[PDB]
Amino acid sequence: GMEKVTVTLDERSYPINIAPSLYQQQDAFWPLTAGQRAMIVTNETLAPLYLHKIQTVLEVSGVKVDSIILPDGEQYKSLFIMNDVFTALLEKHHNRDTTLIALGGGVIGDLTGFAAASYQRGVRFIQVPTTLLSQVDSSVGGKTAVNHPLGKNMIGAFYQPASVVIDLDCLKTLPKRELSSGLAEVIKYGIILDGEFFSWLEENIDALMALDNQAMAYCIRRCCELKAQVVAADEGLRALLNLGHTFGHAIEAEMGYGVWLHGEAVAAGMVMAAKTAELIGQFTPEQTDRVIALLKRAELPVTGPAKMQPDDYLPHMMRDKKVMGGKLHLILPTTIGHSEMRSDVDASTVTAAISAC
Ligand X SMILES: NC(=O)c1ccc[n+]([C@@H]2O[C@H](COP(=O)([O-])OP(=O)(O)OC[C@H]3O[C@@H](n4cnc5c(N)ncnc54)[C@H](O)[C@@H]3O)[C@@H](O)[C@H]2O)c1
Ligand Y SMILES: O=C(CCc1ccc(O)c(O)c1)O[C@@H]1C[C@@](O)(C(=O)O)C[C@@H](O)[C@@H]1O
Instruction: Note the residues at the interface with its own copies (CB under 8 A).
Output: 79-80, 83, 86-87, 90-91, 117-122, 143-145, 148-151, 154-158
Q: Which is nearer to its own copies, 79 or 233 (CB)?
A: 79
Selection from its own copies, ligand Y, ligand X, none that 107 binds (CB < 5 to 8 A by kind) is: ligand X
- Nearest residue (CB) to ligand X, 181 versus 276: 181
How many Å apart are CA 92 and CA 70, to the nearest integer?
A: 17
As a dihedral over the C-alpha atoms of residue 144, residue 146, residue 151, residue 153, rounded to 10 degrees, the angle is 10
Q: Which of ligand X, its own copies, ligand Y, none does residue 43 bind (CB under 5 to 8 Å by kind)? A: ligand X
Instruction: State in angstroms the smallest separation of the CB of 141 from ligand Y.
Output: 3
State the number of CA atoms in the 13 A half-sphere of 91 facing the CB: 10
Q: For ligand X, which is the closer residue by CB, 144 or 287? A: 144
Give, as ranges, the residues between 236 and 255 that touch ligand Y (CB under 6 A).
Answer: 238, 241-242, 245-246, 249
What does the alpha-carbon distance between residue 29 and residue 17 come to, in Å, rounded to a whole number?
10
The answer to whether residue 161 forms part of the interface with ligand X (CB under 6 A) is no
Give whole-number Cα distances, 276 to 246, 265, 271, 349, in Å. 12, 16, 9, 7
* In the complex, least distance from residue 284 CB atom to its own copies, rounded to whole angstroms: 37
Burial category of 166 from C-beta neighbours within 10 Å (exposed 0-12, middle 13-18, buried 19 and up): buried
Query: Are 105 and 130 in contact, with CB atoms under 8 Å apart?
Result: yes
Question: Which residue number places its CB atom closest to ligand X?
Answer: 106
CB of 103 or CB of 271, closer to ligand X: 103
Beta pairing partners, 341? 331
3-state secondary structure 27-52: CCCCCCCCCCEEEEEEECCCHHHHHH
Q: Which does 148 bind (CB under 5 to 8 A by kind): its own copies, ligand X, ligand Y, none?
A: its own copies
Contact set with ligand X (CB under 6 A): 43, 45-46, 49, 72, 74, 77, 104-108, 110, 130-131, 133-134, 137-138, 141, 143, 153, 170, 173-174, 178, 262
